[PDB]
Scaffold this active site. Structure first.
Site, PDB file in Angstrom:
ATOM      1  N   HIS A  43       0.746  -1.262   0.000  1.00 45.84           N
ATOM      2  CA  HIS A  43       0.000   0.000   0.000  1.00 45.84           C
ATOM      3  C   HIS A  43       0.788   1.333   0.000  1.00 45.84           C
ATOM      4  O   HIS A  43       0.233   2.402   0.301  1.00 45.84           O
ATOM      5  CB  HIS A  43      -1.092  -0.011   1.099  1.00 45.84           C
ATOM      6  N   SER A 111      -3.485  -7.958  -1.793  1.00 39.87           N
ATOM      7  CA  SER A 111      -4.600  -7.210  -1.231  1.00 39.87           C
ATOM      8  C   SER A 111      -5.248  -6.279  -2.227  1.00 39.87           C
ATOM      9  O   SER A 111      -4.585  -5.401  -2.773  1.00 39.87           O
ATOM     10  CB  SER A 111      -4.139  -6.364  -0.063  1.00 39.87           C
ATOM     11  N   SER A 113      -7.470  -3.232  -2.737  1.00 38.66           N
ATOM     12  CA  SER A 113      -7.905  -2.085  -1.965  1.00 38.66           C
ATOM     13  C   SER A 113      -9.256  -1.634  -2.522  1.00 38.66           C
ATOM     14  O   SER A 113      -9.395  -1.431  -3.730  1.00 38.66           O
ATOM     15  CB  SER A 113      -6.850  -0.993  -2.072  1.00 38.66           C
ATOM     16  N   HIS A 127      -6.231  -0.076  -6.033  1.00 40.76           N
ATOM     17  CA  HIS A 127      -4.983  -0.765  -6.424  1.00 40.76           C
ATOM     18  C   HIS A 127      -4.991  -2.199  -5.916  1.00 40.76           C
ATOM     19  O   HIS A 127      -5.864  -2.579  -5.163  1.00 40.76           O
ATOM     20  CB  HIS A 127      -3.731  -0.015  -5.893  1.00 40.76           C
ATOM     21  N   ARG A 135      -2.360 -11.034   6.158  1.00 43.75           N
ATOM     22  CA  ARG A 135      -2.947 -12.133   6.908  1.00 43.75           C
ATOM     23  C   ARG A 135      -2.404 -13.355   6.267  1.00 43.75           C
ATOM     24  O   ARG A 135      -1.885 -13.306   5.137  1.00 43.75           O
ATOM     25  CB  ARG A 135      -4.486 -12.122   6.742  1.00 43.75           C
ATOM     26  N   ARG A 136      -2.487 -14.461   6.976  1.00 44.81           N
ATOM     27  CA  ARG A 136      -2.010 -15.709   6.428  1.00 44.81           C
ATOM     28  C   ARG A 136      -3.199 -16.531   5.910  1.00 44.81           C
ATOM     29  O   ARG A 136      -3.203 -17.756   5.979  1.00 44.81           O
ATOM     30  CB  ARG A 136      -1.308 -16.459   7.526  1.00 44.81           C
TER      31      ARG A 136
END
Ligand SMILES: O=C(O)c1ccc(NC(=O)c2cccc(CC3CCCCC3)n2)c(Cc2ccccc2)c1
Ligand SMILES: O=C(O)c1ccc(NC(=O)c2cccc(CC3CCCCC3)n2)c(Cc2ccccc2)c1
Ligand SMILES: O=C(O)c1ccc(NC(=O)c2cccc(CC3CCCCC3)n2)c(Cc2ccccc2)c1
Lengths: 189, 190
Positions: A43, A111, A113, A127, A135-136
């Protein structure tokens, strides 16, 4: 360039709270996304390394395919993959040719967004980040030299979702993608 | 209160096209340097985290001792040593003093910035050295930096430094009161 692919977790940034993880079904009305989204690191804008090619609703969630095209990122990632004892330490065990495994190790997640659920303009999505601090669960990022090999590393994408994804990726000329605006994470301080 | 100690690599135009690593014999005649030079990260100005406390020619190279004094940096690194799986991944499990270990691992290189040998064979006009950087990349000559709360403990980790050289180095280290030094310019991203 490299291809990246995998399911994404969908994340919004609240004011006050740190991170809000959405249920992907909260945003599936807005799939497929064929417009390119910037791919950044953790990010940090200013760390654009490439561009998404498509996000699609597939089996249980949202599958992303992307291109990693930043020559400055690729050169930096390769140098680290080859020469940094620290980048190399957590991998049992390294081929040589270590880049794809070093990327998978240190940027294991994707991730997506999204604006907060509570909203109604602006794009929904901003994005996709290659993520190390996440996180796993929910997302596993796979990096490779062709998109077919990448999509092959997944068990839960059906035959027809796979065909659909590859067809779409086959139509994307990589050299038609604009230059990503990349600076090292350390240069952003 | 952190000290850093180690052998350095000496580099002119670091991380730029004209970059050149100098043999340490090339700058021999401009040592010792006991004036403080800024300590930065990866030759990035605006990442000053402390000040050098001496650069000495010793038998087996150029030894640097420094103080890491930035409170923003120390507080950030300490927090991350305690809480960041990323910071911890490449270090042995469950170390005592995670800050020290995390620094020793992630910033193993000390790089001494120099003018080009062009200017060295004909008596340089100005300062021969600019700064020392803590480096993730590019250590060659050039041992792993040791970080510790005690300067004697730090220098004494290098068996390649003799007892006398240790005393010589430490003579100037304790000769420095850590707090008459200006606040380094590092600002936390957090
Ligand atoms: O600006 C610089 O000169 C510089 C030098 C080294 C590092 N990284 C490291 O020392 C380092 C050490 C171990 C692991 C990693 C992260 C990954 C290794 C290579 C694949 C992509 C990220 N970075 C970084 C941070 C960074 C660069 C690229 C992607 C992310 C973060 C910047
Ligand atoms: O918030 C951000 O945008 C950001 C971007 C990059 C990095 N580090 C890196 O990319 C990086 C790469 C190689 C080595 C280091 C040094 C870090 C020192 C403190 C513990 C973690 C290692 N950072 C950091 C951590 C950090 C940076 C500088 C001083 C303190 C903490 C923060
Ligand atoms: O807010 C927190 O609790 C937190 C936890 C861990 C880290 N990073 C670290 O502990 C850390 C340690 C070493 C190197 C890096 C930079 C690289 C980023 C991406 C690949 C792996 C490392 N970060 C950061 C800084 C940060 C760095 C990069 C992007 C955003 C934020 C903040």
């Amino acid at each position: 360039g490299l291809y990246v692919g995998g399911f994404v977790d969908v994340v919004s940034c609240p004011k006050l709270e740190q991170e809000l993880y959405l249920d992907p079904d909260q945003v599936t009305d807005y799939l497929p996304v064929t417009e390119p989204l910037p791919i950044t690191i953790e990010h940090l804008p200013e760390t654009e390394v490439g561009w998404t090619l498509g996000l699609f609703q597939v089996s249980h969630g949202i599958f992303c395919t992307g291109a990693i095209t930043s020559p400055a990122f690729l050169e930096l990632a390769s140098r680290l993959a080859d020469t940094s004892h620290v980048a190399r330490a957590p991998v049992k065990n390294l081929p040589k040719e270590p880049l794809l495994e070093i990327l998978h190790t240190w940027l294991p997640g994707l991730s997506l967004s999204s604006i907060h659920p509570r909203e109604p303009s602006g794009p929904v999505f901003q994005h996709v980040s290659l993520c190390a601090l996440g996180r796993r669960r929910g997302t596993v990022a796979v990096y490779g030299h062709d998109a077919e090999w990448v999509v092959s590393r997944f068990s839960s994408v059906s035959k027809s979702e796979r065909a659909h994804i590859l067809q779409h990726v086959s139509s994307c000329r990589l050299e038609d993608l604009s230059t990503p605006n990349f600076v090292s994470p350390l240069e952003t301080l």
